[PDB]
Amino acid sequence: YDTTNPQYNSVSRQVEAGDAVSVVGTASQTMKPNLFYNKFFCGLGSIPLPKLH
Amino acid sequence: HQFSSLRTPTGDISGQNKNNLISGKATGRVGNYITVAVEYQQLEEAIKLNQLE
Protein backbone atom coordinates (compact mmCIF):
# COMPACT_ATOMS: atom_id res chain seq x y z
CA TYR A 1 0.00 0.00 0.00
CA ASP A 2 2.72 2.45 -1.03
CA THR A 3 1.55 6.04 -0.55
CA THR A 4 4.16 7.65 -2.84
CA ASN A 5 3.85 4.99 -5.59
CA PRO A 6 0.13 4.16 -5.73
CA GLN A 7 0.50 2.22 -9.00
CA TYR A 8 1.85 -0.87 -7.18
CA ASN A 9 -1.03 -1.25 -4.70
CA SER A 10 -2.48 -4.73 -4.26
CA VAL A 11 -4.71 -4.28 -1.19
CA SER A 12 -7.57 -1.85 -0.58
CA ARG A 13 -6.34 -0.47 2.76
CA GLN A 14 -3.09 -0.42 4.72
CA VAL A 15 -2.79 -2.90 7.57
CA GLU A 16 -1.91 -1.11 10.80
CA ALA A 17 -1.66 -1.75 14.53
CA GLY A 18 -4.67 -3.17 16.34
CA ASP A 19 -6.05 -5.13 13.39
CA ALA A 20 -7.59 -8.59 13.76
CA VAL A 21 -6.00 -11.65 12.13
CA SER A 22 -6.81 -15.36 12.07
CA VAL A 23 -5.13 -18.64 11.17
CA VAL A 24 -6.91 -21.03 8.82
CA GLY A 25 -7.81 -24.52 9.99
CA THR A 26 -7.91 -26.15 13.40
CA ALA A 27 -5.22 -26.61 16.05
CA SER A 28 -2.88 -29.46 15.13
CA GLN A 29 -4.42 -31.73 12.50
CA THR A 30 -2.39 -33.35 9.71
CA MET A 31 -3.71 -33.05 6.17
CA LYS A 32 -2.72 -33.53 2.55
CA PRO A 33 -3.53 -30.26 0.75
CA ASN A 34 -4.65 -29.83 -2.85
CA LEU A 35 -2.80 -27.44 -5.14
CA PHE A 36 -3.74 -24.99 -7.88
CA TYR A 37 -1.26 -22.82 -9.74
CA ASN A 38 -0.41 -20.96 -12.92
CA LYS A 39 2.32 -22.08 -15.31
CA PHE A 40 4.52 -19.08 -14.46
CA PHE A 41 4.58 -19.53 -10.68
CA CYS A 42 7.60 -21.70 -9.81
CA GLY A 43 10.46 -22.74 -12.07
CA LEU A 44 12.82 -25.69 -11.90
CA GLY A 45 16.25 -26.58 -13.21
CA SER A 46 19.13 -28.99 -12.81
CA ILE A 47 22.89 -28.39 -12.61
CA PRO A 48 25.17 -30.80 -14.50
CA LEU A 49 28.07 -32.19 -12.49
CA PRO A 50 31.58 -32.80 -13.88
CA LYS A 51 33.20 -36.21 -13.65
CA LEU A 52 35.33 -36.70 -10.55
CA HIS A 53 39.05 -37.15 -11.16
CA HIS B 1 95.42 -37.92 -15.09
CA GLN B 2 98.66 -36.04 -14.47
CA PHE B 3 102.23 -37.29 -14.80
CA SER B 4 105.87 -36.30 -14.41
CA SER B 5 108.98 -36.81 -16.53
CA LEU B 6 112.55 -37.96 -15.90
CA ARG B 7 115.86 -36.82 -17.38
CA THR B 8 118.77 -39.11 -18.27
CA PRO B 9 121.70 -38.63 -20.67
CA THR B 10 121.19 -42.12 -22.16
CA GLY B 11 117.70 -43.13 -20.98
CA ASP B 12 118.63 -45.70 -18.30
CA ILE B 13 115.66 -45.82 -15.91
CA SER B 14 116.86 -48.85 -13.94
CA GLY B 15 117.05 -47.16 -10.54
CA GLN B 16 114.53 -44.35 -11.04
CA ASN B 17 110.88 -44.11 -9.97
CA LYS B 18 107.81 -44.63 -12.13
CA ASN B 19 104.43 -42.92 -12.01
CA ASN B 20 101.33 -44.70 -10.70
CA LEU B 21 97.68 -44.55 -11.74
CA ILE B 22 95.85 -42.82 -8.90
CA SER B 23 92.13 -42.63 -9.70
CA GLY B 24 89.94 -39.75 -8.55
CA LYS B 25 86.20 -39.34 -8.93
CA ALA B 26 83.75 -36.46 -8.61
CA THR B 27 80.29 -37.20 -7.23
CA GLY B 28 76.87 -35.90 -8.17
CA ARG B 29 73.65 -36.36 -6.22
CA VAL B 30 69.93 -35.64 -6.42
CA GLY B 31 68.20 -32.85 -4.53
CA ASN B 32 64.66 -32.37 -3.20
CA TYR B 33 61.31 -32.53 -4.95
CA ILE B 34 59.63 -29.30 -6.02
CA THR B 35 55.88 -29.84 -5.58
CA VAL B 36 52.96 -27.46 -6.13
CA ALA B 37 49.54 -28.71 -5.03
CA VAL B 38 46.03 -27.26 -5.32
CA GLU B 39 42.58 -28.51 -4.35
CA TYR B 40 38.99 -27.40 -4.88
CA GLN B 41 35.41 -28.62 -4.83
CA GLN B 42 33.14 -29.99 -7.55
CA LEU B 43 30.36 -27.51 -6.77
CA GLU B 44 32.90 -24.72 -7.21
CA GLU B 45 33.93 -26.34 -10.49
CA ALA B 46 30.32 -26.33 -11.65
CA ILE B 47 29.30 -22.81 -10.61
CA LYS B 48 32.43 -20.67 -10.21
CA LEU B 49 35.51 -22.05 -12.01
CA ASN B 50 35.96 -20.55 -15.47
CA GLN B 51 39.19 -20.12 -17.47
CA LEU B 52 40.85 -22.77 -15.32
CA GLU B 53 43.82 -23.07 -17.68
Q: For chains A and B, count residue pairs whose Cβ atoms are closer than 8 Å.
A: 9
**B52 Cβ under 8 Å from any chain A Cβ:** no
Residue by residue, DSSP assigns A22-42 as --SS-SS----------TTS-
Expt. technique: cryo-EM
**B38 Cβ under 8 Å from any chain A Cβ:** no
Instruction: Fill in the amino acid letter for B22.
Output: I
- By C-alpha distance, which of B49, B38, B51 is closest to A49? B49
Q: What resolution in angstroms, rounded to 1 decimal?
A: 3.7
Work out whether the CA dihedral B37, B40, B46, B51 comes out positive or negative: negative
Count the residues in chain A: 53
CB B6 within 8 A of CB B16: yes
CA distance A29 to A31: 7
CA distance A15 to A1: 9
What does the angle CA B18 – CA B21 – CA B27 come to, to the nearest 5 degrees? 155
